PDB file of N, CA and C and ligand atoms in Angstrom:
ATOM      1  N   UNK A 823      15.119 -10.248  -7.169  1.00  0.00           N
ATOM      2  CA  UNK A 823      15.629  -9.292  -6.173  1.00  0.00           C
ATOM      3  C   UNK A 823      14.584  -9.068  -5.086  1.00  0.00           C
ATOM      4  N   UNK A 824      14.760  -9.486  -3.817  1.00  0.00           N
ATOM      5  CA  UNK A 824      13.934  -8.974  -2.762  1.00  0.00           C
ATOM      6  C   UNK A 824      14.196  -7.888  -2.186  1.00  0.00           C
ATOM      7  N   UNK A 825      12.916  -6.923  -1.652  1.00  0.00           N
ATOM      8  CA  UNK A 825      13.018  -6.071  -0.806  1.00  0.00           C
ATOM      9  C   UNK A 825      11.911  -6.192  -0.068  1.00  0.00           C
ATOM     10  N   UNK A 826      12.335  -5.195   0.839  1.00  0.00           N
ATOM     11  CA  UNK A 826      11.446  -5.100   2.439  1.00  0.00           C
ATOM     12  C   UNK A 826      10.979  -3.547   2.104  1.00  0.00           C
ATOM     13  N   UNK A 827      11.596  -2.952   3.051  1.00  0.00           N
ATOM     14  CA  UNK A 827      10.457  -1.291   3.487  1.00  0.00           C
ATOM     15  C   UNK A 827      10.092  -1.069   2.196  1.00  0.00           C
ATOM     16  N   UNK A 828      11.002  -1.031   1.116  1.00  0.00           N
ATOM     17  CA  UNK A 828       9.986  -0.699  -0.285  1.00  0.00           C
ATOM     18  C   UNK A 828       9.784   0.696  -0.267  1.00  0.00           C
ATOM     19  N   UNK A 829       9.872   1.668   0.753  1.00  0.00           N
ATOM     20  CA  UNK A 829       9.203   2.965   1.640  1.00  0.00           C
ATOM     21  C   UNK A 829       7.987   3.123   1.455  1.00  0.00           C
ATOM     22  N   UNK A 830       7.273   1.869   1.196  1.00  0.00           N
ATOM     23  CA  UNK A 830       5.936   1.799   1.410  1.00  0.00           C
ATOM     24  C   UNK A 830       4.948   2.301   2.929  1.00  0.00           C
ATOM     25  N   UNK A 831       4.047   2.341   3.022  1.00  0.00           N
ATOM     26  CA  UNK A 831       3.150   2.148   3.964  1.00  0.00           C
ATOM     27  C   UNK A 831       2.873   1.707   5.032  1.00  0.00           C
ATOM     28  N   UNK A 832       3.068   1.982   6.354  1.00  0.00           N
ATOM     29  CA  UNK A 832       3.337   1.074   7.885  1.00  0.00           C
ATOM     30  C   UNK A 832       2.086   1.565   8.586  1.00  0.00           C
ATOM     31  N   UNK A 833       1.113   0.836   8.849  1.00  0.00           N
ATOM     32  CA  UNK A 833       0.256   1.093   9.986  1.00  0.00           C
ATOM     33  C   UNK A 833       0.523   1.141  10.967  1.00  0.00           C
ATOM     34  N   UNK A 834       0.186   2.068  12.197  1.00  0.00           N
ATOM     35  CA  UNK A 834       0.793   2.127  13.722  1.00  0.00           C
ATOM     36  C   UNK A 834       0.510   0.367  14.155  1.00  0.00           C
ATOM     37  N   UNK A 835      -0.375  -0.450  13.561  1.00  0.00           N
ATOM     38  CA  UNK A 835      -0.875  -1.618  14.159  1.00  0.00           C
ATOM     39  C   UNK A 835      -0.576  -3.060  13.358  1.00  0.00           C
ATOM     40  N   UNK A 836       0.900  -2.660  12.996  1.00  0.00           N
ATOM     41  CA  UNK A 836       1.140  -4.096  12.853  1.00  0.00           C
ATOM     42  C   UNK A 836       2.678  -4.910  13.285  1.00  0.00           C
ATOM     43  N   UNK A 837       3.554  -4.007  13.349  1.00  0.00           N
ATOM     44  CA  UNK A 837       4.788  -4.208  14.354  1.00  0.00           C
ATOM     45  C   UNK A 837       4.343  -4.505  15.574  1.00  0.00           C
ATOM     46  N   UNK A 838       3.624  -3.762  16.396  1.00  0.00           N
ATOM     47  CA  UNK A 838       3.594  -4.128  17.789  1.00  0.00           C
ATOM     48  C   UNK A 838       3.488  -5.795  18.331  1.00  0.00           C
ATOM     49  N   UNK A 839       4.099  -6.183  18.937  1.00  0.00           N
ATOM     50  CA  UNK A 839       3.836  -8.088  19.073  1.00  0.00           C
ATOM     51  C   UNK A 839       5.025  -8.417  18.523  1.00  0.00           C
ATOM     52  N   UNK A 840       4.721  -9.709  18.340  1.00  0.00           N
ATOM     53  CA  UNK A 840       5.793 -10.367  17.706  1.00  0.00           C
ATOM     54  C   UNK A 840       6.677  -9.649  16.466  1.00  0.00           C
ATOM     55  N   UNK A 841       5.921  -9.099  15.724  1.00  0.00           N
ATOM     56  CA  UNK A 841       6.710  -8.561  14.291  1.00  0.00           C
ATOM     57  C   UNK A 841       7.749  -7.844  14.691  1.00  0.00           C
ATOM     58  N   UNK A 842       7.562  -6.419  15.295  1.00  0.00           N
ATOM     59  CA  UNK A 842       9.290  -6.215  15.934  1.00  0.00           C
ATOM     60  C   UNK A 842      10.077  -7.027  16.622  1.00  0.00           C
ATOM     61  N   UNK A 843       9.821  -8.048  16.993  1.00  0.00           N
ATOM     62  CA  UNK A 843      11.049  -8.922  17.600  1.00  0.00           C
ATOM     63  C   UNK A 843      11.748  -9.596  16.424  1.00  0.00           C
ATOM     64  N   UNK A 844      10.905 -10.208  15.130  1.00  0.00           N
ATOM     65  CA  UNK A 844      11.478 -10.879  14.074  1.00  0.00           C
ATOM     66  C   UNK A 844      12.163 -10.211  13.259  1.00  0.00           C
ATOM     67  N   UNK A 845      11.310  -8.508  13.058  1.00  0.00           N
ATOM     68  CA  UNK A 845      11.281  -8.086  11.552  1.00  0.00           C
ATOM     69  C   UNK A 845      12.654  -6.758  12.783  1.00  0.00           C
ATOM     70  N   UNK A 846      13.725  -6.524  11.506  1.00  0.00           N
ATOM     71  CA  UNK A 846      14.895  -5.483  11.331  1.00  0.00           C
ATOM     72  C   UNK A 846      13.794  -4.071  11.299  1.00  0.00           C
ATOM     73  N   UNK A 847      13.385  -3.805  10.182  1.00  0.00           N
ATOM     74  CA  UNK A 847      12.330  -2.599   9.426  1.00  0.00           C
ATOM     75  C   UNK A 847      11.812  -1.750  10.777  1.00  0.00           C
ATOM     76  N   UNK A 848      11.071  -2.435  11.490  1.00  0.00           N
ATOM     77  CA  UNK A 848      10.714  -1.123  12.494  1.00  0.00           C
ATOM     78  C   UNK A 848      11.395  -0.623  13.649  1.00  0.00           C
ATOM     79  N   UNK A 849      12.714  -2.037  13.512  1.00  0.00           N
ATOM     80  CA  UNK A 849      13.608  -1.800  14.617  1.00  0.00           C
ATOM     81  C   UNK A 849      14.512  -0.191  14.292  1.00  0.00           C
ATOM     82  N   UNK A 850      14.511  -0.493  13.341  1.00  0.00           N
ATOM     83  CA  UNK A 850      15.293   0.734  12.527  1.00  0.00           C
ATOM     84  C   UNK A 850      14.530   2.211  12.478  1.00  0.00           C
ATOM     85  N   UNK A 851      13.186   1.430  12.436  1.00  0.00           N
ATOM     86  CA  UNK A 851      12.108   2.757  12.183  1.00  0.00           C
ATOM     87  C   UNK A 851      11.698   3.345  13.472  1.00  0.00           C
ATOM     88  N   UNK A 852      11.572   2.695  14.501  1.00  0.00           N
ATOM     89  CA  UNK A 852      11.695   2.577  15.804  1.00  0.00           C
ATOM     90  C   UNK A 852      13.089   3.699  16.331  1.00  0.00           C
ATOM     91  N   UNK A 853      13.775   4.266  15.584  1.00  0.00           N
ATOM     92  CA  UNK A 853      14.852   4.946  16.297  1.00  0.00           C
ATOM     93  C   UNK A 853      15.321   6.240  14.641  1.00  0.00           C
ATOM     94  N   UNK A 854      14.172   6.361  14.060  1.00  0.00           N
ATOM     95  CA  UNK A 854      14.471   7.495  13.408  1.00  0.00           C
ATOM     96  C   UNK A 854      15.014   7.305  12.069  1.00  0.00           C
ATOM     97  N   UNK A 855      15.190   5.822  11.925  1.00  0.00           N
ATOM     98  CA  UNK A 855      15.802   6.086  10.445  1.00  0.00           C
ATOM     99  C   UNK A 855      14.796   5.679   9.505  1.00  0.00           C
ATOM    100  N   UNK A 856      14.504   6.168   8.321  1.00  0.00           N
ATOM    101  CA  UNK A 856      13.370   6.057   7.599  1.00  0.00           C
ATOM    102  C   UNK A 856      13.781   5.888   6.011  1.00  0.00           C
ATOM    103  N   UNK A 857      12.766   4.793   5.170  1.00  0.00           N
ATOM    104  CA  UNK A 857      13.634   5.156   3.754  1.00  0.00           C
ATOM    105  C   UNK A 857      12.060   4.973   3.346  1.00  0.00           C
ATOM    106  N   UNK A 858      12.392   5.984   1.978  1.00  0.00           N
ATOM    107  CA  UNK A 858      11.467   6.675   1.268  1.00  0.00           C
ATOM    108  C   UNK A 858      10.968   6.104   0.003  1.00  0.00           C
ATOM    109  N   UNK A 859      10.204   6.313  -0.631  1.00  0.00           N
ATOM    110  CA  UNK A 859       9.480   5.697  -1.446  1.00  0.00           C
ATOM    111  C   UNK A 859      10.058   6.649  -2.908  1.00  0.00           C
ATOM    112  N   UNK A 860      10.711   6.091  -4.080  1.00  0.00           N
ATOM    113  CA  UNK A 860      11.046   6.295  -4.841  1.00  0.00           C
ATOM    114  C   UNK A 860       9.539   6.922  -5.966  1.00  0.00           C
ATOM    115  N   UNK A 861      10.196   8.268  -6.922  1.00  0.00           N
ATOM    116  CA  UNK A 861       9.137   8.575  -7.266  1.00  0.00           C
ATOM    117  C   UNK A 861       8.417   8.434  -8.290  1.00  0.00           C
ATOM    118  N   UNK A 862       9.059   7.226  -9.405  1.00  0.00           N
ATOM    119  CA  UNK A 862       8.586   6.915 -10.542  1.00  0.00           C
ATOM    120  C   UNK A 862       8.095   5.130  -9.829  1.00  0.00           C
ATOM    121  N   UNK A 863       6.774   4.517  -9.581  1.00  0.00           N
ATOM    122  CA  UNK A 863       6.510   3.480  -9.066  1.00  0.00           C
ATOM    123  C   UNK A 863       6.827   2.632 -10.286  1.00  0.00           C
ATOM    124  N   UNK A 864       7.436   1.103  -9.817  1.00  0.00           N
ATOM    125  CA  UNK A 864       7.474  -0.116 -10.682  1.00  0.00           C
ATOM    126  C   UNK A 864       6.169   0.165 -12.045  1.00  0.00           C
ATOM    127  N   UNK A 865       5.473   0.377 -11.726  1.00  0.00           N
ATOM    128  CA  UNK A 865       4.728   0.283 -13.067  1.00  0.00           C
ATOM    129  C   UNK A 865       4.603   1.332 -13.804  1.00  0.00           C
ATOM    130  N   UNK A 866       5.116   2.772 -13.153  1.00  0.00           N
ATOM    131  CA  UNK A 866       5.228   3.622 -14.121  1.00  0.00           C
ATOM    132  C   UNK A 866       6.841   3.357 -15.176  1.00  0.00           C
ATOM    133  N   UNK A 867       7.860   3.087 -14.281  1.00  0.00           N
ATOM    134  CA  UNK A 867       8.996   2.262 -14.847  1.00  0.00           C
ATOM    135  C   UNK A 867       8.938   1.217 -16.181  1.00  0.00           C
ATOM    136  N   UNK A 868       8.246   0.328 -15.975  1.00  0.00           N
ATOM    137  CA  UNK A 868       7.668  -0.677 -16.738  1.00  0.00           C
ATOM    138  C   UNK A 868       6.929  -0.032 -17.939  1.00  0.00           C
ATOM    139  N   UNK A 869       6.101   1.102 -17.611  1.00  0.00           N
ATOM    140  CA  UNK A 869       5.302   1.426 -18.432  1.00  0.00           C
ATOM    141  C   UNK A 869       6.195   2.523 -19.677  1.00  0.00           C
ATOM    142  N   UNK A 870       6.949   3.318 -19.255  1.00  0.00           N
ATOM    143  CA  UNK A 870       8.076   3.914 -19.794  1.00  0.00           C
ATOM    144  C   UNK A 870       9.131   2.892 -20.776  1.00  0.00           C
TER     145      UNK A 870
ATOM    146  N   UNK B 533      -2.695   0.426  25.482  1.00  0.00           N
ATOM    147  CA  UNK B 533      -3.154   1.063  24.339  1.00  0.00           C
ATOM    148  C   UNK B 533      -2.743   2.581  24.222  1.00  0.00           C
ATOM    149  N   UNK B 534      -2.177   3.612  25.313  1.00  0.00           N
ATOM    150  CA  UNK B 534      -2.254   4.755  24.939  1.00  0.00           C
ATOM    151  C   UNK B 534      -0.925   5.912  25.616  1.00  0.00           C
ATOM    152  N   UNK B 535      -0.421   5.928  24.918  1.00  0.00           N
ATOM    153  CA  UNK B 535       0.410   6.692  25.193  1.00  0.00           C
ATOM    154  C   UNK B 535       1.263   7.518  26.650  1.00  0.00           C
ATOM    155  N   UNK B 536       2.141   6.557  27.240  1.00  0.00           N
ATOM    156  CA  UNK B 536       2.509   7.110  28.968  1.00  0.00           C
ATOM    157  C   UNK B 536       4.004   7.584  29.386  1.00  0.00           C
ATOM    158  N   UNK B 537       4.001   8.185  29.814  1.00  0.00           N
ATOM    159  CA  UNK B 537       5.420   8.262  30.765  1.00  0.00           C
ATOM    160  C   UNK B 537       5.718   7.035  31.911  1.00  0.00           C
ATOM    161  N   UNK B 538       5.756   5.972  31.363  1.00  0.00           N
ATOM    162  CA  UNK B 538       5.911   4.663  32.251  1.00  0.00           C
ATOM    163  C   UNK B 538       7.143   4.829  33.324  1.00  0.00           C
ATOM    164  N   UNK B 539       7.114   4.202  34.516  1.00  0.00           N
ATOM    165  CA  UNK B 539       8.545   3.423  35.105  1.00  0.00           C
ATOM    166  C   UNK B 539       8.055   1.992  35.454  1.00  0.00           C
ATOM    167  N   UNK B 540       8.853   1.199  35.653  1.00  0.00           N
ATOM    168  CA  UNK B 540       8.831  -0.061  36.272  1.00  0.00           C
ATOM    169  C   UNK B 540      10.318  -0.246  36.842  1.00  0.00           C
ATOM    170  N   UNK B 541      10.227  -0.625  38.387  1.00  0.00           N
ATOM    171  CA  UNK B 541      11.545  -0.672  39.084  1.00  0.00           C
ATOM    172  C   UNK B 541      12.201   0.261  38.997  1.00  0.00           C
ATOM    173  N   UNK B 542      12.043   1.533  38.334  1.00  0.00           N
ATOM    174  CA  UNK B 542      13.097   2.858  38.078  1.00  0.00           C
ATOM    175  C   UNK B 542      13.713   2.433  36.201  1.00  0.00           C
ATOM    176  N   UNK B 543      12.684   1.944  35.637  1.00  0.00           N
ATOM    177  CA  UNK B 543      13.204   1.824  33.984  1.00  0.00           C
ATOM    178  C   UNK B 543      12.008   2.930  33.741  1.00  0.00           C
ATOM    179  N   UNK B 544      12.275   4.012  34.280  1.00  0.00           N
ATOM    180  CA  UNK B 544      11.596   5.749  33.518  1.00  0.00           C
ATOM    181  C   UNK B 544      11.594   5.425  31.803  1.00  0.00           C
ATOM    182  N   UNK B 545      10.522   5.756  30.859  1.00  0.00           N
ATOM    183  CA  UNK B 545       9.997   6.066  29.487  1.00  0.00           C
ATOM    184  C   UNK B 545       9.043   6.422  29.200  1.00  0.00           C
ATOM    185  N   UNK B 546       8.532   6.376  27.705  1.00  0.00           N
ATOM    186  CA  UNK B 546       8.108   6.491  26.821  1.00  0.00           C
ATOM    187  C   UNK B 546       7.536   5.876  25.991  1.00  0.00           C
ATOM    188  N   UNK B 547       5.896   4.966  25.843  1.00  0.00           N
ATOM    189  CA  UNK B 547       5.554   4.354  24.719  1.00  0.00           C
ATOM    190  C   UNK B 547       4.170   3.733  25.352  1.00  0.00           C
ATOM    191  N   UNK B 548       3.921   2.742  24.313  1.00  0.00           N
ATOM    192  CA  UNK B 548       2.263   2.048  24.912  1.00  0.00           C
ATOM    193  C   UNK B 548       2.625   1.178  25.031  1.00  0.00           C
ATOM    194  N   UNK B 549       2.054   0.652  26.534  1.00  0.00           N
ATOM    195  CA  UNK B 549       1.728  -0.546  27.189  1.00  0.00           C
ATOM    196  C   UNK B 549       0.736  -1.309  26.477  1.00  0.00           C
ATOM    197  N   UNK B 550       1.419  -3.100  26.235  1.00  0.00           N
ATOM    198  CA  UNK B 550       0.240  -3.984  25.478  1.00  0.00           C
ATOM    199  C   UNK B 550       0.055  -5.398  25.706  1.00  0.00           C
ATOM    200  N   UNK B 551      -0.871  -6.054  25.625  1.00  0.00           N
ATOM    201  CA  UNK B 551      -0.645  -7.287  26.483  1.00  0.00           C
ATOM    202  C   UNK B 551       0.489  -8.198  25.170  1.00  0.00           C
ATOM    203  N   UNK B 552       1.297  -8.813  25.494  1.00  0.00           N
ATOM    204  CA  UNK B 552       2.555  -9.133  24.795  1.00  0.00           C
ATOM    205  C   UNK B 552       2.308 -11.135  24.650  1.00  0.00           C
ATOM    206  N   UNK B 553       2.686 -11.381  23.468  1.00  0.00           N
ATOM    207  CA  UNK B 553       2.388 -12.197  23.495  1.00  0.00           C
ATOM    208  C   UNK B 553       3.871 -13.644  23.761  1.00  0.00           C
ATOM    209  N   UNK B 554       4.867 -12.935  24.667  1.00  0.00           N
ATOM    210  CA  UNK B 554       5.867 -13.216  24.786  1.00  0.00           C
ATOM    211  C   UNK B 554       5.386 -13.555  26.183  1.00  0.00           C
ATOM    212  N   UNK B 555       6.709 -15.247  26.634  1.00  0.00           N
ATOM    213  CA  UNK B 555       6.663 -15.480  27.833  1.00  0.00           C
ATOM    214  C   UNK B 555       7.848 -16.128  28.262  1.00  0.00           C
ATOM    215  N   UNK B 556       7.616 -15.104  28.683  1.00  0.00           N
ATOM    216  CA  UNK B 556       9.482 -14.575  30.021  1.00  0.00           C
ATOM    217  C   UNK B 556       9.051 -15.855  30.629  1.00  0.00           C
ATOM    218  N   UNK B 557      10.408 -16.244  31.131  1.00  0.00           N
ATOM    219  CA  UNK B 557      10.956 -17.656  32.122  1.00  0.00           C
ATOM    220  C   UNK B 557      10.825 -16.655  33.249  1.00  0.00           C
ATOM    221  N   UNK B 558      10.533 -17.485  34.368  1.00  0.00           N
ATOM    222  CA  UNK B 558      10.110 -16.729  35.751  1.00  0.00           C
ATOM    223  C   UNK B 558      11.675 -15.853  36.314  1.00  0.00           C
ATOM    224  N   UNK B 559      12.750 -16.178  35.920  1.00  0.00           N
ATOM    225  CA  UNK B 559      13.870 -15.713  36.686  1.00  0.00           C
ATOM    226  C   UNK B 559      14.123 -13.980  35.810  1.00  0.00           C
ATOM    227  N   UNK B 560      12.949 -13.711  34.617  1.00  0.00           N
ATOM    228  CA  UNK B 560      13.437 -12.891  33.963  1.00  0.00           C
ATOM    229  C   UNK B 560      12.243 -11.569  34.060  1.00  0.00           C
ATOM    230  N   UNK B 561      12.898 -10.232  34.205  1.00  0.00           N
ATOM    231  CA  UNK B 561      11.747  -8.933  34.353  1.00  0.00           C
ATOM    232  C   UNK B 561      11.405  -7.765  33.501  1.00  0.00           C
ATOM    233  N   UNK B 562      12.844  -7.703  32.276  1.00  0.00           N
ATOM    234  CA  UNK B 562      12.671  -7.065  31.366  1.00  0.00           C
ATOM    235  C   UNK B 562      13.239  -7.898  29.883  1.00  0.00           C
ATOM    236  N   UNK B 563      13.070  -7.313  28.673  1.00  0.00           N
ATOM    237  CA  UNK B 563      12.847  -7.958  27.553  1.00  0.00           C
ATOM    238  C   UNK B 563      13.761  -7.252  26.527  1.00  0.00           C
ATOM    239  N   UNK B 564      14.539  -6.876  25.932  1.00  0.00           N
ATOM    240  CA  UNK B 564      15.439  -6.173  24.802  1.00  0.00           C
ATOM    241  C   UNK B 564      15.465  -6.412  23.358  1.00  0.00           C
ATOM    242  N   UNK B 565      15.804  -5.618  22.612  1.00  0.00           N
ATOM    243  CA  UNK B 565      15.739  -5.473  21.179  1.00  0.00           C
ATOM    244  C   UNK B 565      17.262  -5.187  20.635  1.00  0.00           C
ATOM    245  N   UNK B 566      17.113  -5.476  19.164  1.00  0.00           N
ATOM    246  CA  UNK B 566      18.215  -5.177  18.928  1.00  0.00           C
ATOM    247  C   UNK B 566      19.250  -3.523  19.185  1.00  0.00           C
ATOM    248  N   UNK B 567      18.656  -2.518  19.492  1.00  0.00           N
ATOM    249  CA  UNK B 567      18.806  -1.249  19.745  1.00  0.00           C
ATOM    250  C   UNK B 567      19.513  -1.129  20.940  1.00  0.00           C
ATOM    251  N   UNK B 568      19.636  -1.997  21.801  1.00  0.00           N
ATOM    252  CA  UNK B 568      20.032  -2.508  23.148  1.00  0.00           C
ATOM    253  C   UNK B 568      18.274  -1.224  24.201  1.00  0.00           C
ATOM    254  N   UNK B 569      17.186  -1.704  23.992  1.00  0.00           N
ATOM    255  CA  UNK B 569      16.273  -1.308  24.846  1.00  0.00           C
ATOM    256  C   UNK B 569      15.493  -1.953  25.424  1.00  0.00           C
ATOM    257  N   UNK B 570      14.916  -1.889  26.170  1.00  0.00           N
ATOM    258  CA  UNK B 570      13.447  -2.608  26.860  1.00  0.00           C
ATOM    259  C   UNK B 570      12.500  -2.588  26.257  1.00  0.00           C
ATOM    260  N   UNK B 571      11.903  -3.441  25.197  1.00  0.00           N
ATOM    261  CA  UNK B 571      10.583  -3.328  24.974  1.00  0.00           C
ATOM    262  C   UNK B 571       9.616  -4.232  24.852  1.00  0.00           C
ATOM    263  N   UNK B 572       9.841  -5.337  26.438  1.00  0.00           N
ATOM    264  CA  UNK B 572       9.024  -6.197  26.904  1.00  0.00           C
ATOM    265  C   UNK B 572       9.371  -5.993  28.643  1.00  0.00           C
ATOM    266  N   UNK B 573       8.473  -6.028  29.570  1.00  0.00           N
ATOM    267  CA  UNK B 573       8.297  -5.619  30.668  1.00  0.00           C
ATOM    268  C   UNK B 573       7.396  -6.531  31.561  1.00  0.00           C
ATOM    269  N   UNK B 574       7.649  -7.376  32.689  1.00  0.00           N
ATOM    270  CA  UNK B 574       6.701  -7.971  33.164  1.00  0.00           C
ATOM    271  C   UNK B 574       6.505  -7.231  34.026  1.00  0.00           C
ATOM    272  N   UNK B 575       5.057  -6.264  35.015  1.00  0.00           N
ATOM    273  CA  UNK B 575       4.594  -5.639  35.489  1.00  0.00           C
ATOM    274  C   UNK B 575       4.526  -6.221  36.759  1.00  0.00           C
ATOM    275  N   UNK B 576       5.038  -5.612  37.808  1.00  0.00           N
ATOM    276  CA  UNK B 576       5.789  -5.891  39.150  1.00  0.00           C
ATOM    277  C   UNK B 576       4.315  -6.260  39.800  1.00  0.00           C
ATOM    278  N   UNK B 577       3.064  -6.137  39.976  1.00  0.00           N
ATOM    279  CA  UNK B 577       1.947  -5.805  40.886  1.00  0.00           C
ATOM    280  C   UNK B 577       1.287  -7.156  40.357  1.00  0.00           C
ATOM    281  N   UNK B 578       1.566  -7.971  39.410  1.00  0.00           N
ATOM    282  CA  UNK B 578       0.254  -9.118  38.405  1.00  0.00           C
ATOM    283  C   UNK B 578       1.060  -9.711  37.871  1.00  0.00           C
ATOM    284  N   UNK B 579       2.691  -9.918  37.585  1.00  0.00           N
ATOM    285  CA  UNK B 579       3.494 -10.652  36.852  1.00  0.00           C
ATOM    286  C   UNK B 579       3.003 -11.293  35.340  1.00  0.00           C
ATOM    287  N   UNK B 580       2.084  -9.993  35.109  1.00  0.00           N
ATOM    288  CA  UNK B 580       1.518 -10.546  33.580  1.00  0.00           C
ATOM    289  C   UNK B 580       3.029  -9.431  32.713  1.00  0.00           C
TER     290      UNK B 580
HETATM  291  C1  LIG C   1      -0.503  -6.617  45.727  1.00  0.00           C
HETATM  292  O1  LIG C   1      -0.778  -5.997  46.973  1.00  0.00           O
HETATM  293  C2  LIG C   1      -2.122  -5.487  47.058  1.00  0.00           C
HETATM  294  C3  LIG C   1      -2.221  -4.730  48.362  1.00  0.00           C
HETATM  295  O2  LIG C   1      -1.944  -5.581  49.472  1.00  0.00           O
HETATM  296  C4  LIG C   1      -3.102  -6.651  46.970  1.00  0.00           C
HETATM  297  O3  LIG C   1      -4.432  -6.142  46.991  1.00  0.00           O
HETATM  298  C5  LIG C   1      -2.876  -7.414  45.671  1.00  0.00           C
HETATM  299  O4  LIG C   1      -3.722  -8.555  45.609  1.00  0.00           O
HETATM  300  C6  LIG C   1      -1.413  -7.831  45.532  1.00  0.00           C
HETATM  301  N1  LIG C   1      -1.149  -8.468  44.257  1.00  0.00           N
HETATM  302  C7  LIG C   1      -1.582  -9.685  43.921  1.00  0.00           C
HETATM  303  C8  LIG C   1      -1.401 -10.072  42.486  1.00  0.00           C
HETATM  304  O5  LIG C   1      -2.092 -10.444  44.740  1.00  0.00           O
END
């Protein structure tokens, strides 16, 4: 299963350039919509 | 790098100016995203 935002972590300095023209994620983030980071992480999951 | 109330030709905004590593065909002056916006600009005074 792939994912993207993950609602991980975005530095102001890495969309700018090329990456917003390729990447959907900041185009989206870029106009307010935001998804969040779930609160039990993969390895606490795993670890359970 | 820093944060402006830009216009170019009367396109009035909002955001930072950066040197872009995109290159517009000479017949072309602004740049769009999927959002339908401008966010590539060739600068009327240096055509950079
Ligand atoms: C634009 O006009 C100014 C004023 O005449 C001039 O100094 C400048 O060199 C012009 N732009 C370019 C890229 O030559």
């Amino acid at each position: 299963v792939t994912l993207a935002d993950a609602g991980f972590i975005k530095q102001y300095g890495d969309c700018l350039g090329d990456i917003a023209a390729r990447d959907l994620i900041c185009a989206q983030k870029f106009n307010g919509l935001t998804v969040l980071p779930p609160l039990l992480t993969d390895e606490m999951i795993a670890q359970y | 790098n820093k944060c402006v109330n830009f216009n170019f030709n009367g396109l009035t905004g909002t955001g930072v100016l950066t040197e872009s590593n995109k290159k517009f065909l000479p017949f072309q002056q602004f740049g769009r995203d999927i959002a339908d916006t401008t966010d590539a600009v060739r600068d009327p005074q240096t055509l950079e």
